[PDB]
């Protein structure tokens, strides 16, 4: 006969009912020293009584409506579960009694716990009795090979975990921790969330299991792992009662920084949503089912009375727990005078599910009632009769039930027995009028939209941590700027890293970089390694300051030479001084002008033209000059041997020799004007590799031997003072030439491109200048100052 | 139910065994009234288990001491591995208590964690002891919900720990998981995921299966298995819930993986088939420890459908064995020893022993109830119960405090969670050479009593991989990191597969699998392979150095020449024939030159503050002395312009001090610093000497050069006064050589590093002073060695 505290009402058809009027049982572990007696449940739950009242109201409204099942009445045998499996199981045993004078229940609306409903459906489905639950939302109840006769008016919990992952990815967090009740409601949900979050590149720090029967040390361990971690977001998948101990311990230890992502079961629970817990838990964003509309329901709630309820048996205990009677009292108080979750509501969510379940079973019964004897759902097109209806026929009609909810909706269960709905997203607020926690809706989750466009959050209503209004930071490691790269911290997950600076020559312009990048050769990483500033190029320039000095020196040399040439041109036909060789004079002067001009080739970038011309350019020009001044010496060879052609002919041997060398590189290995940087790695010199070294040596040596013979012959006879004994002058000249080159070799041996070229040009320009000077200074002086030209 | 094994007695036990493997797959669309479902495939192992229970019961009934005059009856049913059959059997068990709101006292068995949960939810309602023998889920240890559930099989958390330990023992880190979607696979796989994740082991994929998943789910699972690179696959499932996946695997011929079997299917007969074995090679599984039930086999060899009225399962057993009918009509004369079945083709009793132990434990609980004495009982006030009217909760209370010895001499004692622990044997699938059946050879041990870390013990010499090879396959996400490289993140992949990037020059990485390169200190530099660093190159002139050798020999030759000429004078040193000049000035100049030369001693090795801060000013003073001496050497027309010739000495001993002045300044203002510098080479450390005070060196050098310059001007302007070979010209040419050398040598000092800088400096000095000495003496020495014409 089941328990004695129950709600009961007769009728042709009887429906079952399991509601959590209490919260749990008295935890007195029977040591079995005596016969174990029936355990007792302890706490009270006004929400559960609201649900039971909703079911009773639905049945009464069905019995009152004249169209749905006329000339037939609905009865019920509603029991209490106290949220435990033992009570539900004894109740269901009282249900299926007559199967194998007692009424035979045809349908069961209840089992609000996914652990409770599992154990109930295991037993009901053995007799094929339809069980229409309203609040059990575990996914395991979708295995229609196990629970053959289980339907539910509440959506499955897959979309809830998906929505949790979507919310976490929307605020751009990647470091969270998960808590789930060690039950059939938290385990599968947390596993689904784990996979959905790992596929979205989200890292999970810790994962713990709790329960209302967990001892104190395990709660200590959980609080420790919560405190010892850096994750700010905590995804809780549990119900009110199985969460209350952890909340009490967290309030006692005063952990304040975290953010709670509430699941639907406890996001609106009065056990948790109280101010003293609110000050500590801070910000909670949770889900909620869609509201309902049961017109005329409040006026039914306001009529509950202990004496006017013979059918209802829990009304007495309700009166007691709400007024503390039997301190005996009157029984004529007002339910509106005290504030309890009973009528302190604005949106009916689970009560609407109970209403809908009762109405769906009534509609299946009507469907069986309005049959046509030819188009039935059973074998041979036959159909069943409502006077001897059995449970399996009602199950058959429920599987194919498809009707219209008074809100103008379509109600029809899937092939997995469940419905589907679109969640509201609420965020906990503190009412400035009362102090109580009030749930304000801030977002929506439509599950029909395509994957990726389902969530809609209105961020300006979310109140963060009570005061501030910017999204808190809950990443593992700080995201560091461009110029740096991620660096593995071994042991830690893929979301936690250090970041190391990029070396020079590599850059990174992106945030969250995986590696730095080498830029092309003529580019180089800048001072912040964020962008390769185009590199600089090494060579002498014309606007260059020291290049300016050099070029002005060259111009002055040419000016002096040409002006002296013109001054001669005054006396150019007064052989008074031209007792020397006129043509040799002009030739030497022009050779010097051109050698000077050669410096044109050392002030800018070398194209093959520039380099391979300039170098041999000096060669020929200076060699001409030297040979000319040399032949300027006494005619000893002429004395030893058809016009003076000889003199010209003489020079026009030596010259060719070196012109010879030029042509060789013209077709063997001409110098290469190319870019070189390997010795600087930051700036690219533009140098000119010698075409054939030893052949340059040969050239220079030939020239120096010509100069050396000139030197020897000018000195050895340097003491024959003819017209101021220019032997000595030219000797001193050739020696200056020697010394300059000598001393300047080192620099050429120990320097890069730029100053190498600069020193080379200085050397040449100045040496030729000195030659010209040493040869003319005296003569010009005398023929400008002492016009004593008779001998 | 109708078919059952029933025997009467004073005390009744219950049993639940999977005689069949499952029910006939047929979906009732409920067009008609549903009827009793039927079971399809036979299970000889379950029948051996049932026979073990019956054998234990009858043997206890035959013992004189254990339950002396009592009698044990039993009512054994079949679960068909489904929940509905078990639940209707249970409803048949609790009929006596159900009528409150043939009473059994205890039930032995569920065989399945789902069946166990569904049964214990109902049995714990009446406090009836349920002693399972194979239910190994961890959810049944929650004694707040399953009050009266005891099991004689170890829990399955140690099994997940053992699997993680095996994986980290064979050095794998890229694995994948498969689980049955029931109360046995899900908790085990979650526990293994935790245990692996804490050991830094990666899990590539994670799937769920069941015997009811249709072709598309299995195809998606096989796609996930194939499109991955993990070789090791852990499987937490039973035989039936794994058979479809195995069929699909053997059809698609996936033939590369390594299977880590859980206990349920490691020794299963549905999976251990020779045809499946070709593609499921290299199977490594767990097993319970063997038992000894003496006299069991002979009891098995007596089954017969006629002489078994208590047992009812014998008829279908014979029909399934001989494939007969009681199509060809059957006859009770066959030989159960002829056909080969999982019934009698066994070698170790592992789950039959658990049934034996469960029955014996219930018997010993009843015994403890029986040999109790008043005042020493366990119930209220020390009171004790009567065995002739024993109730279920009393046997439960006695079972919680049960402690006895097995037939093998071990201590059976249920933990406070109602489960006794045991070791694990570790087997590996082999192929029998004779017939061809799969043979399970024991290759390892797992002791749960040893401390964490030294529990596993594998014998590598017996494991054979893939049938032919004998080296452990490679199943890592990425190949290892060789020395000289470092790990590099791939943005999307998990932590255990990376890339290999090279350490830059200046950093090395000797360790394998290094997360970052290390920079060697100031003294060292990376190798070529960036493996270890070697010391950075030092930079300075050395004495054994070749060019240092050339320099030092030049210095020695200079000193030799000077000193030899000094001695040659010493011959004529008192013949003022040539000494018409100033004797003492002569000696002073010669000594100054010898010492300036000797100064070169300070440019051939590393500078200590001594060396640098002495050498530099060393040249200063020595050469300045020499210059002033030769200078004063010119006739003092200034002296005429101006008590002994002290004046001359005094003269010089002004100028000198000036520069000695400068020295003392750096002596206490900023003396040069002999330090190491490398920033311009980064590979070899020069050992240079930063100037103490630059502009003051400039002042010093300038003072010296102005002295030289006045000497030059005065020697030339009068360079045409040929007194004793007009040495005015000689000394002028000298001072000019000095000038030219310094001029031309400035550039190198301006454009070079340490080493050749010092070398050029020393060359310059040495040679210049040499030339001075020469230009001043060559002629005079020549004449007084060759033309001794000294009269005027
Ligand atoms: C925490 O880490 C995540 C990445 O794991 C960051 O999310 C990125 O945010 C930027 C800016 O919106 C996006 O461009 C990226 O696409 C995001 N990454 C991914 C994978 O979507 C997040 O910004 C970090 N949190 C903070 C405060 O910076
Ligand atoms: C799913 O959430 C969405 C959000 O409103 C609801 O879909 C809307 O319903 C109304 C009426 O059909 C339309 O005006 C909107 O256009 C719909 N939005 C979209 C994107 O289609 C819907 O009501 C929710 N699901 C249920 C069963 O109510
Ligand atoms: C599990 O672990 C070992 C088996 O390897 C058993 O301990 C050994 O038992 C024998 C005899 O009992 C001793 O001689 C050894 O010294 C033991 N070895 C160690 C390391 O202790 C142990 O008995 C097994 N546990 C059970 C319940 O059988
Ligand atoms: C696969 O990855 C693991 C992870 O390191 C490697 O394990 C290492 O193996 C060497 C050799 O014994 C050990 O010295 C290391 O200590 C191990 N690493 C860790 C963190 O324990 C393994 O070597 C890799 N597989 C192969 C074939 O190289
Ligand atoms: C401008 C100069 N040539 C310069 C530039 C190219 N050449 C050179 C020398 C040395 C090295 C490296 C080394 O050996 O250390 C590389 C190049 C020396 C020149 C012009 C005309 C006639 C010359 C007659 C005689 C010497 C020079 C002459
Ligand atoms: C050995 C030499 N001193 C050398 C070495 C140190 N000093 C120096 C010069 C220039 C720079 C950098 C720059 O300005 O480019 C750095 C150091 C020049 C010396 C010895 C004795 C008397 C001297 C009298 C006059 C000049 C030199 C004298
Ligand atoms: N889905 C919840 C049931 C539930 C929904 N809302 C609730 C509110 C309070 C308690 C329980 C619930 C479960 O599986 O347990
Ligand atoms: N322990 C398994 C059942 C099991 C163990 N060993 C077995 C051998 C054969 C069949 C089933 C089993 C479970 O929890 O369900
Ligand atoms: C709890 O922690 C917060 C952190 O600031 C602090 O403000 C508050 O005073 C603490 N309250 C108690 C009771 O410790
Ligand atoms: C309760 O008492 C009466 C009867 O219900 C009602 O009119 C009254 O408004 C209620 N009291 C309050 C404070 O609302
Ligand atoms: C049944 O479902 C269809 C569409 O699915 C809808 O048109 C109809 O209104 C539903 N109800 C009935 C009674 O057909
Ligand atoms: C199956 O896989 C194995 C290994 O690749 C190969 O030898 C064999 O040919 C494949 N096909 C069949 C039918 O076995
Ligand atoms: C047949 O039964 C008996 C056992 O007593 C014996 O002849 C023999 O063992 C059995 N046959 C075979 C092949 O074992
Ligand atoms: C259990 O039995 C053994 C053998 O009598 C004994 O050693 C032990 O003390 C007993 N009690 C416990 C708690 O083990
Ligand atoms: Ca309930
Ligand atoms: Ca990923
Ligand atoms: Ca609640
Ligand atoms: Ca780790
Ligand atoms: Ca079973
Ligand atoms: Ca099996
Ligand atoms: Cl509600
Ligand atoms: Cl076995």
């Amino acid at each position: 006969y089941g328990p004695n505290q129950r709600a009961q009402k007769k009728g042709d058809i009887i429906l079952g009912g399991l509601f959590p009027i209490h919260f749990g049982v008295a935890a007195k572990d029977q040591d079995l020293k005596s016969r174990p007696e029936s355990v007792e449940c302890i706490r009270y739950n006004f929400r559960g009584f609201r649900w039971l009242q909703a079911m009773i109201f639905a049945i009464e409204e069905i019995n009152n409506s004249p169209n749905l099942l006329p000339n037939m009445t609905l009865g019920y045998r509603i029991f209490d579960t106290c949220n435990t499996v033992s009570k539900a199981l004894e109740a269901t045993l009282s249900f299926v009694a007559q199967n194998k004078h007692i009424p035979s229940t045809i349908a069961v609306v209840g089992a609000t716990g996914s652990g409770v409903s599992t154990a109930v459906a295991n037993l009901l489905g053995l007799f094929y009795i339809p069980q229409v639950s309203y609040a059990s939302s575990s996914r395991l109840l979708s295995n229609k090979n196990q629970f053959k006769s289980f339907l539910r008016t509440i959506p499955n919990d897959e979309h809830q975990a998906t929505a949790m992952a979507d919310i976490i990815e929307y605020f751009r967090w990647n470091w969270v921790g998960t808590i789930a009740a060690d039950d059939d409601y938290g385990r599968p949900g947390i596993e689904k969330f784990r996979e959905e979050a790992e596929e979205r590149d989200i890292c999970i720090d810790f994962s713990e299991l709790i329960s209302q029967y967990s001892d104190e040390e395990e709660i200590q361990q959980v609080v420790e792992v919560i405190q010892n971690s850096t994750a700010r977001v905590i995804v809780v998948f549990s119900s009110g009662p199985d969460l209350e101990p952890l909340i009490k311990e967290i309030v006692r230890r005063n952990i304040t920084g975290k953010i709670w992502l509430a699941s639907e079961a406890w996001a609106s629970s009065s056990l948790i949503a109280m101010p003293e817990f609110f000050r500590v838990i801070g910000s909670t964003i949770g889900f909620a089912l869609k509201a309902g509309q049961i017109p005329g329901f409040r006026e039914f709630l306001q009529k509950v009375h202990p004496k006017k309820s013979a059918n209802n048996g829990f009304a007495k205990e309700f009166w007691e727990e709400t007024f503390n009677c039997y301190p005996p009292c009157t029984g004529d108080e007002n339910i509106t005078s005290v504030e309890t979750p009973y009528m302190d509501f604005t949106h009916l969510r689970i009560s609407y599910n109970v209403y809908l379940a009762v109405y769906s079973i009534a509609h299946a019964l009507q469907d069986i009632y309005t049959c046509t004897p030819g188009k039935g759902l059973f074998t041979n097109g036959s159909c069943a009769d409502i006077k001897k209806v059995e449970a399996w026929q009602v199950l058959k009609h429920l599987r194919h039930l498809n009707f219209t909810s008074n809100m103008g909706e379509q109600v029809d269960f899937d092939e997995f027995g469940d419905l589907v709905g679109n969640y509201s997203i609420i965020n906990w607020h503190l009412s400035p009028e009362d102090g109580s926690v009030v749930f304000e809706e801030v977002g929506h989750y439509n599950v029909y939209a395509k994957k990726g466009e389902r969530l809609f959050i209105n961020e300006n209503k979310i109140l963060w941590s009570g005061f501030s209004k910017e999204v808190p930071f809950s990443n593992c490691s700080r995201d560091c700027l461009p110029g740096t790269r991620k660096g593995i911290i071994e042991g830690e997950p893929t979301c936690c890293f250090e970041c190391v600076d990029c070396p020079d020559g590599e850059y990174s312009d992106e945030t969250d970089a995986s590696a730095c990048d080498k830029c092309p050769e003529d580019y180089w990483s800048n001072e912040n390694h964020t962008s390769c500033i185009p590199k600089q190029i090494e060579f002498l320039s014309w606007t260059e300051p020291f290049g300016i000095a050099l070029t002005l020196f060259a111009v002055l040399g040419i000016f002096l030479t040409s002006f002296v040439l013109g001054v001669f041109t005054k006396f150019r036909n007064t052989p008074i001084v031209k007792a020397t060789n006129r043509e040799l004079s002009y030739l030497l002067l022009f050779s010097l002008l051109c050698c000077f001009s050669s410096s044109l080739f050392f002030i800018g970038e070398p194209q093959n033209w520039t380099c391979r011309l300039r170098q041999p350019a000096f060669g020929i020009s200076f060699v001409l000059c030297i040979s000319c001044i040399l032949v300027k010496t006494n005619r000893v060879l002429l004395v030893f041997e058809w016009g003076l052609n000889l003199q010209f002919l003489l020079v026009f041997l030596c010259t060719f020799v070196q012109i010879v060398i030029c042509v060789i590189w013209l077709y063997t290995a001409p110098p290469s004007s190319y870019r070189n940087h390997e010795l600087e790695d930051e700036i690219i010199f533009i140098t000119c590799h010698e075409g054939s070294l030893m052949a340059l040596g040969f050239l220079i040596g030939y020239t120096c031997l010509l100069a050396a013979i000139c030197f020897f012959f000018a000195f050895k006879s340097r003491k024959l003072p003819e017209n101021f004994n220019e032997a000595k002058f030219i000797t001193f000249s050739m020696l200056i030439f020697f010394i300059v080159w000598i001393s300047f070799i080192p620099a050429y041996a120990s320097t890069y491109g730029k100053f190498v070229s600069a020193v080379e040009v200085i050397a040449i320009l100045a040496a030729s200048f000195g030659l010209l000077a040493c040869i003319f200074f005296n003569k010009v002086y005398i023929i400008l100052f002492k016009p004593s030209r008779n001998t």
Side-chain angles (χ1 to χ4, degrees), chain A residues 2-100 102-325 327-577 579-613 615-634 643 645-689 691-717 719-787:
Chain A
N4 47 25
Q5 266 313 319
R6 55 173 159 200
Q8 203 152 14
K9 178 181 170 193
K10 290 70 44 194
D12 317 87
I13 297 168
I14 304 304
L15 316 188
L18 312 183
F19 295 93
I21 303 310
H22 288 294
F23 273 111
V25 284
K28 293 179 179 179
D29 181 303
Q30 261 84 359
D31 289 345
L32 303 178
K33 280 179 181 182
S34 149
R35 158 167 305 182
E37 293 177 350
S38 295
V39 82
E40 55 170 347
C41 295
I42 37 179
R43 271 185 290 188
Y44 209 84
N45 188 19
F46 299 98
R47 219 178 159 195
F49 194 80
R50 170 142 57 78
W51 295 349
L52 185 135
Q53 284 296 306
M55 169 176 180
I56 287 183
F57 174 51
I59 282 185
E60 242 164 72
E61 181 188 43
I62 290 304
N63 275 339
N64 192 211
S65 201
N67 55 71
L68 225 44
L69 299 102
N71 300 268
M72 255 185 174
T73 67
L74 270 182
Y76 52 85
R77 280 173 42 201
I78 314 176
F79 287 125
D80 175 15
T81 64
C82 299
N83 243 321
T84 167
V85 188
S86 55
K87 290 279 181 302
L89 269 189
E90 43 89 357
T92 62
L93 283 178
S94 65
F95 280 162
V96 307
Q98 203 74 107
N99 277 241
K100 279 160 196 171
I102 294 180
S104 195
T105 299
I106 305 89
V108 170
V109 189
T112 174
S114 40
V116 181
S117 48
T118 280
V120 169
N122 282 324
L123 184 60
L124 283 180
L126 174 67
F127 301 89
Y128 291 105
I129 290 194
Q131 166 184 6
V132 187
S133 149
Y134 48 75
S136 36
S137 63
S138 64
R139 91 162 165 79
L140 313 183
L141 300 165
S142 302
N143 177 16
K144 289 317 173 185
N145 309 276
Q146 272 266 322
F147 318 101
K148 309 176 185 180
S149 96
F150 184 79
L151 295 174
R152 41 185 179 183
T153 77
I154 187 181
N156 191 328
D157 184 1
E158 300 275 57
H159 305 296
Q160 187 153 42
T162 301
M164 296 270 199
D166 281 5
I167 292 187
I168 286 185
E169 100 174 353
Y170 168 88
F171 289 117
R172 292 173 296 180
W173 292 319
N174 75 323
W175 191 242
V176 305
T178 70
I179 294 172
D182 192 357
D183 195 7
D184 278 339
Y185 169 69
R187 284 193 253 97
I190 213 67
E191 205 73 14
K192 170 69 166 185
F193 168 84
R194 194 199 52 80
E195 80 156 77
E196 281 307 313
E198 71 81 43
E199 90 154 271
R200 283 176 170 82
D201 306 297
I202 301 174
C203 280
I204 284 191
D205 190 4
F206 60 96
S207 66
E208 299 297 327
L209 304 157
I210 66 182
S211 90
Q212 52 172 347
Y213 299 140
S214 92
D215 181 65
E216 215 284 330
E217 293 177 350
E218 293 177 350
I219 296 182
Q220 287 300 343
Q221 186 173 355
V222 173
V223 175
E224 293 299 86
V225 68
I226 284 184
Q227 218 166 7
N228 280 17
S229 92
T230 74
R232 262 221 189 193
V233 178
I234 311 181
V235 177
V236 181
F237 256 100
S238 148
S239 150
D242 282 277
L243 189 78
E244 203 187 359
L246 179 68
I247 283 301
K248 284 181 184 174
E249 189 82 349
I250 294 169
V251 158
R252 181 177 181 170
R253 285 221 189 181
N254 190 26
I255 304 196
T256 77
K258 314 301 183 172
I259 303 185
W260 309 92
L261 295 174
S263 64
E264 195 279 307
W266 75 274
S268 325
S269 196
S270 100
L271 289 192
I272 307 298
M274 292 177 72
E276 293 177 350
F277 298 164
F278 182 50
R279 299 152 150 274
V280 166
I281 64 192
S283 36
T284 84
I285 317 183
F287 294 97
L289 304 184
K290 218 59 171 177
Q293 287 295 335
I294 314 176
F297 189 37
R298 283 235 174 188
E299 293 177 350
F300 178 68
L301 291 181
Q302 300 178 359
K303 296 175 181 176
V304 54
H305 214 162
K307 183 178 179 180
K308 209 198 174 188
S309 64
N311 302 326
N312 186 340
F314 310 87
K316 183 178 179 180
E317 187 165 9
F318 169 77
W319 214 247
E320 293 177 350
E321 297 276 351
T322 191
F323 291 142
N324 313 278
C325 294
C329 80
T330 78
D332 289 345
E333 309 77 6
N334 191 0
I335 318 96
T336 78
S337 324
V338 56
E339 293 177 350
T340 47
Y342 191 55
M343 303 200 314
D344 189 302
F345 73 88
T346 60
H347 302 325
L348 313 86
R349 316 186 192 264
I350 311 296
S351 64
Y352 189 59
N353 293 18
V354 178
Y355 181 68
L356 275 66
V358 183
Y359 252 78
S360 99
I361 289 172
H363 272 286
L365 280 185
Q366 159 75 333
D367 200 318
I368 297 191
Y369 170 70
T370 177
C371 183
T372 76
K375 293 179 179 179
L377 289 186
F378 307 101
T379 179
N380 283 341
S382 52
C383 176
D385 51 320
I386 202 169
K387 293 179 179 179
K388 303 181 173 188
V389 57
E390 299 187 336
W392 64 277
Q393 292 152 341
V394 180
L395 176 56
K396 178 67 183 181
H397 267 256
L398 269 156
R399 279 172 167 167
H400 304 162
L401 180 129
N402 156 39
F403 89 107
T404 297
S405 153
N406 65 347
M407 297 179 53
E409 293 177 350
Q410 293 177 335
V411 181
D412 56 321
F413 309 108
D414 201 48
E415 293 177 350
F416 304 130
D418 43 290
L419 252 172
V420 284
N422 283 348
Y423 298 108
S424 147
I425 284 178
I426 66 180
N427 164 259
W428 277 15
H429 279 188
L430 195 149
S431 148
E433 293 177 350
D434 276 358
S436 39
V437 177
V438 299
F439 322 99
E440 174 178 345
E441 58 91 2
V442 317
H444 190 290
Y445 193 85
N446 168 24
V447 73
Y448 303 105
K450 293 179 179 179
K451 293 179 179 179
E453 183 178 2
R454 280 159 164 176
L455 176 54
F456 160 73
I457 290 183
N458 173 279
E459 287 197 39
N460 64 34
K461 307 235 202 59
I462 296 191
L463 209 71
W464 290 107
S465 88
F467 50 97
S468 174
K469 293 179 179 179
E470 64 281 350
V471 163
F473 171 84
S474 166
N475 279 31
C476 184
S477 88
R478 293 178 179 83
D479 197 339
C480 77
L481 295 174
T484 189
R485 66 159 185 81
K486 288 182 197 162
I488 285 189
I489 303 185
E490 183 178 2
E492 301 323 290
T494 166
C495 303
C496 315
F497 50 74
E498 58 187 6
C499 59
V500 179
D501 303 316
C502 293
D504 289 345
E506 299 174 18
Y507 63 89
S508 311
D509 62 80
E510 301 280 346
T511 318
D512 270 347
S514 182
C516 320
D517 320 286
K518 293 179 179 179
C519 55
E521 293 177 350
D522 55 14
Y523 289 92
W524 191 249
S525 59
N526 65 53
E527 293 177 350
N528 298 133
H529 317 250
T530 66
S531 45
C532 289
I533 307 167
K535 291 174 65 175
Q536 293 177 335
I537 295 155
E538 209 67 354
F539 78 119
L540 303 194
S541 69
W542 310 71
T543 74
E544 194 173 5
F546 279 75
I548 287 142
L550 180 75
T551 184
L552 62 85
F553 273 0
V555 60
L556 69 84
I558 197 52
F559 165 98
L560 178 157
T561 74
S562 316
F563 166 85
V564 171
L565 268 281
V567 192
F568 285 101
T569 318
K570 282 166 213 161
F571 312 154
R572 204 62 73 52
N573 313 337
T574 71
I576 58 172
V577 55
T580 52
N581 175 285
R582 314 172 134 180
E583 195 59 342
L584 276 188
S585 318
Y586 309 111
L587 204 75
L588 267 164
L589 318 178
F590 217 82
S591 84
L592 258 59
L593 271 78
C594 76
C595 72
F596 276 178
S597 62
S598 297
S599 92
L600 185 157
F601 315 141
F602 296 129
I603 305 87
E605 60 86 5
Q607 47 265 46
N608 271 320
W609 302 37
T610 321
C611 62
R612 288 152 85 236
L613 280 53
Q615 164 53 22
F618 194 162
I620 68 167
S621 186
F622 159 82
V623 295
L624 193 162
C625 320
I626 183 172
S627 300
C628 299
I629 271 181
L630 185 154
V631 80
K632 183 178 179 180
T633 59
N634 307 326
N645 272 316
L646 57 88
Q647 285 198 339
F648 269 62
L649 254 182
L650 263 289
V651 312
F652 285 172
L653 166 59
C654 297
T655 50
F656 280 97
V657 180
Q658 301 325 89
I659 212 165
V660 185
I661 301 95
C662 91
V663 309
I664 283 183
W665 306 341
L666 201 44
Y667 298 121
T668 66
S672 57
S673 87
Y674 70 74
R675 313 221 177 190
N676 170 9
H677 48 279
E678 291 71 43
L679 67 162
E680 174 51 354
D681 287 281
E682 293 177 350
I683 316 191
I684 282 189
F685 315 142
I686 46 184
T687 178
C688 279
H689 199 49
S692 82
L693 64 164
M694 282 311 298
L696 280 171
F698 288 128
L699 166 56
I700 312 299
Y702 184 99
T703 321
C704 68
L705 272 299
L706 321 182
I709 66 175
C710 192
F711 168 61
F712 167 38
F713 279 17
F715 166 74
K716 68 174 301 284
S717 167
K719 276 61 64 180
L720 292 68
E722 67 95 21
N723 181 1
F724 319 123
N725 189 320
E726 310 325 330
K728 55 184 174 184
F729 285 60
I730 56 178
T731 48
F732 199 74
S733 74
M734 307 169 275
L735 215 51
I736 61 171
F737 158 93
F738 293 146
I739 70 149
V740 191
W741 278 101
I742 307 162
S743 315
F744 269 68
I745 177 51
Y748 227 110
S750 76
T751 312
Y752 49 69
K754 180 179 185 73
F755 274 177
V756 158
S757 87
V759 61
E760 198 212 3
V761 55
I762 287 284
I764 61 171
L765 169 151
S768 164
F769 158 86
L771 160 52
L772 177 63
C774 82
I775 182 51
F776 283 24
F777 157 60
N778 55 343
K779 311 188 176 178
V780 295
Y781 187 96
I782 75 165
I783 305 188
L784 57 78
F785 178 73
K786 172 184 164 181

